[PDB]
Structure formats: C-alpha cells, structure tokens
Write a protein that binds this ligand. Structure first.
Ligand SMILES: *[C@@H]1O[C@H](CO)[C@@H](O[C@@H]2O[C@H](CO)[C@@H](O)[C@H](O)[C@H]2NC(C)=O)[C@H](O)[C@H]1NC(C)=O
Ligand SMILES: *[C@@H]1O[C@H](CO)[C@@H](O)[C@H](O)[C@H]1NC(C)=O
Lengths: 50, 50
C-alpha cells in the first residue's frame, strides 16, 4: 500500500528593492557638507550603481 | 529609468525664535573690576537670564 503526503517547501526569491542617497544620508541637508562630499569624489556613483 | 537626484523643496523663509527679554548681562564688572581674588580662591559669576 502507498500514501500520498503533500510537503510544503519555502524558498525566498527576492528581497526589498532598497535605495540610499548620499546627500540625504551623508549630509543633513546642508551645503558645506555637500561641498566636502563632492570633494571626496565618486563614491556615491558607485554606491548608487551597486 | 534612471535615478539622478531627489525632489528637494527649499525652505521659504528663516524663522528666528529667541526669548523676548532685553536685560544686558554685566560683562563690564566681570572683565574689569577693582579687585580680583587670586588663584587659590577664585570666584564664580553665574550669569543668568539676560
Ligand atoms: C491503504 O491505506 C489507506 C489509508 O490508510 C486505506 O484506506 C483506509 O482503509 C480503512 C479500511 O481498510 C478505512 O477504515 C479508512 O477509512 C481508509 N482511509 C482512507 C483515508 O481512505 C486503504 O484501505 C489501504 N489499502 C489497502 C489495500 O490496505
Ligand atoms: C570696565 O571698563 C568699561 C570700559 O569703559 C567700563 O564701562 C566698566 O564700567 C568697567 N567696569 C568696572 C569699572 O567695574
């Protein structure tokens, strides 16, 4: 004799599509901070691309 | 689709809120007086509410 047993199997497929902006996070909406951040270079482009 | 910047709304005006009193603090007697006690026993001038 045989039995049929349904088995559940869970698999994550995706996570939340987050996004981070420097001048909002790195700078508290200031101006001099923006000057210094643009002085540091192109880290923010790399972060946004990633 | 590209993500370039953030929709930032600039502030309109500059509100300033300071207490409404007009008592001048006595800095003149503090900076220059007839006698100042020496280092072994120095005084405390508690400037408050001016
Ligand atoms: C195979 O197994 C099933 C499940 O146990 C059997 O079905 C049961 O049979 C008994 C009596 O034989 C009943 O009292 C139950 O109500 C049945 N259960 C269900 C879910 O139908 C089936 O009889 C077995 N087959 C053989 C040839 O033994
Ligand atoms: C300290 O000097 C200033 C300068 O004129 C004067 O107005 C003030 O009365 C002086 N403070 C004193 C003498 O305690």
């Amino acid at each position: 004799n045989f039995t049929i047993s349904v088995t559940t199997e869970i698999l994550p497929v995706s996570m939340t599509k987050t996004s981070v902006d420097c001048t909002m996070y790195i700078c508290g909406d200031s101006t001099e901070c923006s000057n210094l951040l643009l002085q540091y270079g192109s880290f923010c482009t790399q972060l946004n691309r990633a | 689709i590209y993500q370039t910047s953030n929709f930032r709304v600039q502030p309109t005006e500059s509100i300033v809120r300071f207490p409404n009193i007009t008592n001048l603090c006595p800095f003149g007697e503090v900076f220059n007086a007839t006698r100042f006690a020496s280092v072994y026993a120095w005084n405390r001038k508690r400037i408050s509410n001016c």
